[PDB]
Amino acid sequence: NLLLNDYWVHNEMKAEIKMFFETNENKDTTYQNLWDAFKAVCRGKFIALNAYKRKQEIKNDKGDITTDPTEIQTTIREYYKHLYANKLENLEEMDTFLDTYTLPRLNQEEVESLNRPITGSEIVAIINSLPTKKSPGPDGFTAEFYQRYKEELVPFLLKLFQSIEKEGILPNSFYEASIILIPKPGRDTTKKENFRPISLMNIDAKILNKILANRIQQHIKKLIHHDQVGFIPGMQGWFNIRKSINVIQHINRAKDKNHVIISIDAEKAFDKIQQPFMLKTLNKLGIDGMYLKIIRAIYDKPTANIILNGQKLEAFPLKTGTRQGCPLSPLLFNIVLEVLARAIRQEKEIKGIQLGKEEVKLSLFADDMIVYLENPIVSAQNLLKLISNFSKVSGYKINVQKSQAFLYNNNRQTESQIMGELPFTIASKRIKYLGIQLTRDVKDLFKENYKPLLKEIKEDTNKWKNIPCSWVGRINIVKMAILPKVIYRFNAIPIKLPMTFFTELEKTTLKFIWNQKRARIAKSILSQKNKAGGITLPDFKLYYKATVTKTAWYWYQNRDIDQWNRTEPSEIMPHIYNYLIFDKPEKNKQWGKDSLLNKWCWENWLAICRKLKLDPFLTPYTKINSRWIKDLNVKPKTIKTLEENLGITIQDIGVGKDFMSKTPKAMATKDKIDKWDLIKLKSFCTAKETTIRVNRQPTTWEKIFATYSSDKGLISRIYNELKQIY
RNA sequence: AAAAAAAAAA
């Protein structure tokens, strides 16, 4: 990195790049070996430049405790290679499972989009969007190499990529990788299976599959189901938590408790899937041409070298298991699990939980898959056989030791047959999920999710006390260490939190920032913006308030990829959860009791807007399909007529004296609109009140809840907005 | 200490 910032070295390497390749332009060889030789000559040149600058300036198989550096090499290497070398040869048996069920088929245009030749725009975007301060596959290189030498490799990489077009093979240096062993959180180091494989590959290799990932990233939503939320941009991890928690609330209210909840976690699923399976599934869903050709060469014979205690252990062929840390690998992880997800979904012998008209049966993540079952006498047994059959074709062995379950039964005699037969660790109190605890009882959801939470900072704040640093150095780590983690809890679990709860949370922080001393500056002044002299002190009371309103956005957009919002129980007339925000309010209809995470949002949604002195039921950002127009008898087809034309807001449609007539294309639309609809709609905005309500400039608050579809920093806008009003 | 989750911290 330091050598990469030298102007003389930069010019020398620019000259070497310019007059190196055009010295042996021979047709006898290929471009991959020339590429590797260019890497080697770059390594030699950097070695020479560094020299010039320096001149100028655990338990074994028997269970015994072993500490010998030579002995441990023979154990972990054998254990890793034993699992990695086991490649399934039952190719004919493998295809039978795939033909049993159905997988999506990509349209030719999408395949052509994946088969589209790499342009000069993808190269610049990926290299620009390359995070720094990281370590790739060694190569004697670093990440800053391609972020500084962009100009000479912008056309050159296409030439390197053009070689793949006529060959479909990868360079020998592309296959190398560096698996880094890091311990799992809160696990003993004595067991050889408690380490995490972190394989770092070449930046050039890391680039290559990224477009392969990026090309399928634009099509991943069509491929996999919406149930999986792992590593899918536009989808958040807490989706399952809210989805899952609603089930226990349903199970608690349900008098007939005979359903079972299991959190199936797999032991190192990142490395125990079969390359033949993942290659043929990629063939089975319509992918072919270059995409099938290039993906075959990527995993034709991948290998990785182990590094431990400063030893460059020799590499070995990864016969099975996708490479860890590859950006494309998680996308492939979903697909191999996707057919698994469909297999359980399409298995009608095992039934899912029917929440009204919504069918909820299972959920996925990276490793912590959860399946909801009822009548475990048959359904649970039917679950095991499919996984073993999937394991028989993929090596997907479920970690029954580390995976718990939740049993809800009314007869103790029936319960005895579960632990006796089902080998799952039936935990009757709580289970682990990404740091959250799905309590058996909803009344205990507050206790086991926040009482451990409040004491978590109690000893955490009991550590950063003796550091000789200023009071300014206390608030920043609060926003860095504890603040990011807590909002995960509110986002996953927005229960009505008593004011007493925030007392300990605030007071613990208060003694931390001043180091067990009285406040030197006013809290209100310090809570203001930097412009007014403040530091923007975190306010968890509003952060909880903001996070309760964070989910208020999803009702407006009503994306079909979110199902958890429809899981709330309702013993009365069906879903209205789409026509609530920015719509006419329904009278003589109040939610509560069974509803836990929706009514509180509405109670908090109305509270904030009333303080703003705003009418939320009629806004410029009102949806065209809002119930305000559905109050009277209207034709559903009529909304579809202008859905393709304007589609977004009633305001753009026209109001006042501009009934569906404000823009030239509307003149070509009114003919399509039914004439009984015109008289119905011409009376809608005739009233003066209806005009002023919409004919107004939208404020900042309504902006974020309509625009800003890339909902990544919704907290920042809402919390800042709540700071000003409150 | 990598793919992806995130608070923006400017």
Author numbering: 254 to 310, 393 to 1061
Task: Give the authors' words.
The LINE-1 (L1) retrotransposon is an ancient genetic parasite that has written around one-third of the human genome through a ‘copy and paste’ mechanism catalysed by its multifunctional enzyme, open reading frame 2 protein (ORF2p). Human L1 encodes two proteins, ORF1p and ORF2p, the latter having endonuclease (EN) and RT activities, along with three other domains with unknown functions. We report structures of the human ORF2p ‘core’ (residues 238–1061, including the RT domain) by X-ray crystallography and cryo-electron microscopy in several conformational states. The structure reveals the fingers, palm and thumb of a characteristic right-hand RT fold but also shows key differences compared with other RTs. Two folded domains which we name ‘wrist’ (863–1061) and ‘tower’ (240–440, described below) are absent from other known structures of RT enzymes from viruses or mobile elements.
To understand the structural changes resulting from binding of the primer and template, we used single-particle cryo-electron microscopy (cryo-EM) to obtain reconstructions of ORF2p in three distinct states: in an active ternary complex with incoming dTTP and template–primer; bound to oligo-25(A) ssRNA; and in apo form (to 3.30, 3.66 and 4.06 Å resolution, respectively). This is the first reported structure of an RT bound with ssRNA in the active site. Comparison of heteroduplex and ssRNA-bound states revealed distinct template paths (template RMSD of 3.76 Å) but overall maintenance of similar contacts through movement of flexible loops, notably in the palm and wrist domains. Apo ORF2p, lacking bound nucleic acid, was unstable, with a melting temperature (Tm) of 34.1 ± 0.4 °C. ORF2p was markedly stabilized by binding single-stranded RNA (ssRNA) (ΔTm = 14.4 ± 0.6 °C) and further stabilized by binding an RNA:DNA hybrid (ΔTm from ssRNA-bound = 2.7 ± 0.4 °C, ΔTm from apo = 16.1 ± 0.4 °C). Modelling using molecular dynamics simulations and AlphaFold indicated that the tower lock is consistent with orphan density above the n+4 base in low-pass filtered cryo-EM maps of ssRNA-bound ORF2p and may therefore fold down and ‘cap’ the RNA template.
